[PDB]
Amino acid sequence: XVXXX
Amino acid sequence: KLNIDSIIQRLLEVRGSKPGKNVQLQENEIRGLCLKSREIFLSQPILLELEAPLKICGDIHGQYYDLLRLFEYGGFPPESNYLFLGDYVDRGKQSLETICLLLAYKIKYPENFFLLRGNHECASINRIYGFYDECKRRYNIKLWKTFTDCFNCLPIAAIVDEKIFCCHGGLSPDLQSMEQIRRIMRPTDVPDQGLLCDLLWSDPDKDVLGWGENDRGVSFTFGAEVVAKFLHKHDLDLICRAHQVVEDGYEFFAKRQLVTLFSAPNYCGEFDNAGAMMSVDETLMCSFQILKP
Numbered sequence A: 001x002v003x004x005x
Numbered sequence B: 001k002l003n004i005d006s007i008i009q010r011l012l013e014v015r016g017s018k019p020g021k022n023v024q025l026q027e028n029e030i031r032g033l034c035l036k037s038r039e040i041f042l043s044q045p046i047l048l049e050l051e052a053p054l055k056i057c058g059d060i061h062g063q064y065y066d067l068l069r070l071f072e073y074g075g076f077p078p079e080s081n082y083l084f085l086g087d088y089v090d091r092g093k094q095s096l097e098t099i100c101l102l103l104a105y106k107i108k109y110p111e112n113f114f115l116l117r118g119n120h121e122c123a124s125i126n127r128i129y130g131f132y133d134e135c136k137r138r139y140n141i142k143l144w145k146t147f148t149d150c151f152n153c154l155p156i157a158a159i160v161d162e163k164i165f166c167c168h169g170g171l172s173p174d175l176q177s178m179e180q181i182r183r184i185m186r187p188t189d190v191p192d193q194g195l196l197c198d199l200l201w202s203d204p205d206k207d208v209l210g211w212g213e214n215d216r217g218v219s220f221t222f223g224a225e226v227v228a229k230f231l232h233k234h235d236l237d238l239i240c241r242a243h244q245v246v247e248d249g250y251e252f253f254a255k256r257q258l259v260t261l262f263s264a265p266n267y268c269g270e271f272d273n274a275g276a277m278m279s280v281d282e283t284l285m286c287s288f289q290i291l292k293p
């Protein structure tokens, strides 16, 4: 979490 | 006033202790590291011109015991010369030790040790992804703001022997010449989209041939045709970049005209990736050292 988990 | 050798000694003292064991430097010592390194960053070009032999490393993300393994494998400075590609903090549990060690080595060996800016050396990002919380827990928020001032002065790109172009993220549709990079004035947060943003954030993508949309919500993707035209225009042989987790720690893109390096094994405790480091020798031969997950 996409900023990349 | 700053005892560099003693800070390094205290950071290296936990070598072979239980992974996760903290080094609690004094706040004034950490602030000293930030302010001295910032001075050095500002005295050196924003586009570094570097010469081989050199070991090149990708994202570390606060995995301090993995950073020590990279030095154990590659030779602790000044035994080898180093270029790091950014993403020192956030995600891992020891961003503090990680950044303190790299800033200490920059001060100690300012012509043999180099650090580029990544997208996580940016206040907006490091606020959410772990570095702010770590500073709040172990020191305070004013020290986090201090790091922010230091990060804003980091150089953005490097060229290794006129042939290997190095940055954190990748290429930009606004990038026409190397002078554009040199024009960028520091200190800068990265307030706008554009060239600087793209150098920190962009990604290769095999399913675009030109420029494409980036799933991250920011910047662009770029295809093989883009890499080819860039390496031609500026008479270069390779792009070296970081920013994306890859399984073997290194991964080739665009018909081996680009390599991605990622230096933090078992990223986040979730991926089963290796970490890697690229050694470039004096005859411009490249080799890869793998850190096992």
Ligand SMILES: [Mn+2]
Pocket: B016, B017, B018
């Ligand atoms: Mn112990």
Ligand SMILES: [Mn+2]
Pocket: B140, B141, B142
């Ligand atoms: Mn505070």
Ligand SMILES: [Mn+2]
Pocket: B177, B178, B179
């Ligand atoms: Mn130029």
Ligand SMILES: [Mn+2]
Pocket: A004, B059, B061, B087, B120, B243, B244
């Ligand atoms: Mn990263």
Ligand SMILES: [Mn+2]
Pocket: B087, B118, B119, B120, B168, B200, B242, B243, B244
């Ligand atoms: Mn990144």
Ligand SMILES: [Mn+2]
Pocket: B245, B246, B247, B271, B272, B273
């Ligand atoms: Mn993977």
Ligand SMILES: [Mn+2]
Pocket: B252
């Ligand atoms: Mn291949």
Ligand SMILES: [Mn+2]
Pocket: B206, B253, B254, B255, B256
């Ligand atoms: Mn390809």
